[PDB]
Amino acid sequence: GHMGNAAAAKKGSEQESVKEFLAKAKEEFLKKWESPSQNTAQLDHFDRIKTLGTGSFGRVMLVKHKETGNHYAMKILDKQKVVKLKQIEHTLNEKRILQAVNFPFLVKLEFSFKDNSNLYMVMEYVPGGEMFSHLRRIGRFSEPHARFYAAQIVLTFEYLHSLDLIYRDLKPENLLIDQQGYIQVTDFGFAKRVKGRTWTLCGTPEYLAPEIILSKGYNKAVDWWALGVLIYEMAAGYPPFFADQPIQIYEKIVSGKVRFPSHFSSDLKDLLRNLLQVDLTKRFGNLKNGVNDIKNHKWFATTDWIAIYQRKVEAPFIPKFKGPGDTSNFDDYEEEEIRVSINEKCGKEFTEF
């Protein structure tokens, strides 16, 4: 067979141990999921320094704790805007997930609180910027470079899926690089606890699995499709399915006809054909062997999974930082004073925050 006796027993024991660690991790998650934390700091505790990113909900600012001197990223959400955009449940769900999970590649929520105008989520500052910026800056990652990042997403999705969470928002724009060159996942607004199927059309066109686009329901396998898209884009410099308009992107996806660059290794193409598999019955990560079909693929043969998890692998790229609070890896945004109203807005809707 493909493995001798020694190899097969080692791999089987390893996989059984993974299951045991995940069962314990799920118990810790569910304890915090059912009894979330709240109001663990206040706005006057921080100095606002610079906007790091901007979105529909509001702003993410670099701040510094006035007492501990530590730097943090503070996501600021305008309650009225969140209501107006009908994002109440997504916002509450993001915070509930962030305070309940624990994994080396998931951003750490340190504090959260709210006032009359806004909700605040204060996260560990990830100073290296988006993977997107670094990918477009150098064009494409070498296959070892892409594999290093891919392995972290594989472990992160294996963790999240064991908690019955579907991530659904994977793309280089949503992956931050930390000071050690490792990945941090920050955005969980689209994540959903799903033990069976779900139906919501959400996410980013290039990264949508066919069964998200089509009216049929879907499950966590859409994240393994999205992993295939990410690996492809990391190694090629562009995604497998693109067009001027999302509708034409969706047509390519549902065909799933993929062309690969001539510099892709045959190992990489085989893996991607099995991740970018339109047939649910055949997609890697969705078979009887689950994620081990991915972890045991020849493209990952040189991947030391424990070492990745333990963050003992030397990163292929370390962002430069000229001191604490360095924002040189982030774009610039229009500053604007945070205005707190004298009147409480949408208090009932955000009681659980």
Binding site: F132, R136, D169, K171, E173, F190, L201, C202, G203, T204, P205, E206, G237, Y238, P239, F242, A243, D244, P246, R259, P261
Partner: peptide, 18 residues
């Protein structure tokens, strides 16, 4: 090239969720 077609798509910057 495929890459030239990617550039021509105009979807070379940051991509919004739907």
């Amino acid at each position: 090239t495929t890459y030239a077609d990617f550039i021509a798509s105009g979807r070379t910057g940051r991509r919004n969720a739907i």
